[PDB]
Structures are given as structure tokens and as C-alpha cells.
Write an enzyme that holds these catalytic residues in place. Structure first.
Site, short mmCIF file in Angstrom:
data_model
loop_
_atom_site.label_atom_id
_atom_site.label_comp_id
_atom_site.label_asym_id
_atom_site.label_seq_id
_atom_site.Cartn_x
_atom_site.Cartn_y
_atom_site.Cartn_z
N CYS A 54 0.83 -1.22 0.00
CA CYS A 54 0.00 0.00 0.00
C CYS A 54 0.85 1.26 0.00
O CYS A 54 0.54 2.23 -0.73
CB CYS A 54 -1.04 0.02 1.13
SG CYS A 54 -0.33 -0.13 2.73
N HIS A 224 -2.33 1.89 7.12
CA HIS A 224 -2.57 1.75 5.71
C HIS A 224 -2.20 3.07 5.00
O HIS A 224 -2.38 4.14 5.56
CB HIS A 224 -4.07 1.42 5.47
CG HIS A 224 -4.38 1.00 4.07
ND1 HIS A 224 -5.63 1.16 3.50
CD2 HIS A 224 -3.61 0.44 3.12
CE1 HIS A 224 -5.61 0.70 2.27
NE2 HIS A 224 -4.39 0.26 2.00
N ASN A 244 -8.46 3.90 -2.59
CA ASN A 244 -7.81 2.74 -1.96
C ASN A 244 -7.16 1.95 -3.10
O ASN A 244 -7.39 2.26 -4.30
CB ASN A 244 -8.88 1.90 -1.24
CG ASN A 244 -8.31 0.91 -0.22
OD1 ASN A 244 -7.09 0.75 -0.05
ND2 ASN A 244 -9.22 0.26 0.49
#
Ligand code: NA
Length: 277
Positions: A54, A224, A244
Site C-alpha cells: 500500500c 494503511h 484505496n
């Protein structure tokens, strides 16, 4: 996944910007996709697959956006997640999690080659890992709990791509943190484009389907890293609009919204970006 950079390193490796001298009207909502409609990367959702990359995704996504925005649409590229993931040694541990700030430093110092999704097989170094479902069901196989090993750093392009790896590198000119301050983050995104940011993951995030996310129940799962593309308001509640990296079947067609203005899940605490000129 994503972990916070040591604060002595964060403070010293790059400047922090606040845009306090900039007295612009901040609109009540903003969407990078609308301001720069010819920059196709801004509206592209990616999939990190079975890999804790990520940190690299939020980075190469915002970098690909900014390359188009800040060149007036002359550079239209899709930067390689795998090149950054596998080659940046100061960014952390590849598929086992990494740190945002140094990825932008790496983009400035070494640069990052082009590379599409696995399925598109395009550019110097396309992503080696397939799309999969993250905490939901849909058209792709479930990700499950297994994690790929970080690929080695290869410094060569796929066979059919003609520009040599070194000459395919796209570099930033500068990297920086953004001050933990709502108005500074808004000013940054509207002037220079989407930013990368990090937030704390709680168990209830993995159940998010729609709406403005805020942490209500569940324990922390870690961190994240994502890409903030704009902001808005619904029924008087302010939010950030965020891409995302769990493909388009997750959340609101790949995107989500989260409370803005209250450092919800520390969303306003680790904002990082940079400029190509
Ligand atoms: Na990709």
C-alpha cells in the site's frame, strides 16, 4: 502494512509545507478528477494484490497524477509499483509493509520506471501479482491470508518494452511533508494534485461498504497508506475523498470517504507529496 516514519527522520529528510501565505478561497468540495479530466491516472483504481505494498501504491498513484498535472498533460504515464516496491531499500520491507515518506525521497533521487497492472502487461515493469478480493466478494478470487515474497530489484524492462530501464526513470524535483492541518492539505491538493497519506486501520474498516467512514468498533490492525484526491460534504458532515488500492470492487467503486478535520484515524498526520518542477 504501512508504518510511520521515525519523527527525527521525517523532520530531517524533507521540508514540511503549510501554504499559510497562500490566501486562496477553498471551495467547499473538490475532486481532482474534475479539475484535471485529461489526466487519466487520477480516476484509475489499482490493486496491490497479496502484498503489503500500500505504501508504494499510494506513492506511484499520486506521482503518476502529479506528472500529468504539473506538466499540463504532457507526461501521461503509469508509474511502476513493482519498481518502487522492490528497489527502494530505505522504504521498509517490500510486501511486508513500508514507509511513505522515503518513497517520495526515492522518486526524487532515483526516479521510478513506468509499469501497468499485470493484466495490462504494459510499460517497463508491469505489476507481477493478480487482482484479488480484499475483505469482500466479487469477480476476482479472494486474496486470502498468504503474502507474496517481495520480488528482487531487477533493473531491466520487460522484453517488448524498448526504452532501457535507466532512461525510463521518471524523477520528482522535490519531496515534502504536508503540515497536519486541514486547510494546508486542501490547498496542497487543489494546487498540486492528489497526495499520499496514512491512517490507522481498525477492525471495522474491513467491513466498510459505503458512506463516510469513522472508527466506531474494533481493535487496531495496523496502518494503511492511500491517495487523497479531494474532499466534500454530505448533510453538513465534512469528508476526504480517497482512492484505496484494493481494486474497483471494494468500497465505493474503489474509493472511500472518511471524516475530515478531526485527524480521524490520524488521516491528517502523515501527508506526503512532491513536485516534478
Ligand atoms: Na498497477
Amino acid at each position: 502494512g504501512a508504518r510511520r516514519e521515525e519523527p527525527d527522520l521525517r523532520r530531517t529528510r524533507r521540508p514540511t509545507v503549510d501554504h499559510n501565505d497562500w490566501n486562496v478561497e477553498i471551495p467547499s468540495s473538490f475532486d481532482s478528477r474534475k479539475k484535471w479530466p485529461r489526466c487519466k491516472s487520477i480516476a484509475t483504481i489499482r490493486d496491490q494484490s497479496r502484498c503489503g505494498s500500500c505504501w508504494a501504491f499510494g506513492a506511484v498513484e499520486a506521482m503518476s497524477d502529479r506528472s500529468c498535472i504539473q506538466s499540463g498533460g504532457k507526461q501521461n504515464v503509469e508509474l511502476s509499483a513493482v519498481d518502487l516496491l522492490s528497489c527502494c531499500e530505505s522504504c521498509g520491507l517490500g510486501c511486508e509493509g513500508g514507509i511513505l515518506g522515503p518513497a517520495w525521497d526515492y522518486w526524487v533521487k532515483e526516479g521510478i520506471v513506468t509499469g501497468s497492472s499485470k493484466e495490462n502487461h504494459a510499460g517497463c515493469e508491469p505489476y507481477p501479482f493478480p487482482k484479488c478480493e480484499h475483505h469482500t466478494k466479487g469477480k476476482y478470487p479472494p486474496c486470502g491470508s498468504k503474502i507474496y515474497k517481495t520480488p528482487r530489484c531487477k533493473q531491466t524492462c520487460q522484453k517488448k518494452y524498448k526504452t532501457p530501464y535507466t532512461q525510463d526513470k521518471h524523477r520528482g524535483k522535490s519531496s515534502y511533508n504536508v503540515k497536519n492541518d486541514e486547510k494546508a492539505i486542501q490547498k496542497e491538493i487543489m494546487k498540486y494534485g492528489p497526495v499520499e497519506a496514512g491512517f490507522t486501520v481498525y477492525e471495522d474498516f474491513l467491513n466498510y461498504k459505503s458512506g463516510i467512514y469513522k472508527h466506531i468498533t474494533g481493535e487496531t490492525l495496523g496502518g494503511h497508506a492511500i491517495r487523497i484526491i479531494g474532499w466534500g460534504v454530505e448533510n453538513k458532515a465534512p469528508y476526504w475523498l480517497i482512492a484505496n488500492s484494493w481494486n474497483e470492487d471494494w468500497g465505493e467503486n474503489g474509493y472511500f470517504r472518511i471524516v475530515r478535520g478531526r485527524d480521524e484515524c490520524s488521516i491528517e498526520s502523515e501527508v506526503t507529496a512532491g513536485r516534478i518542477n
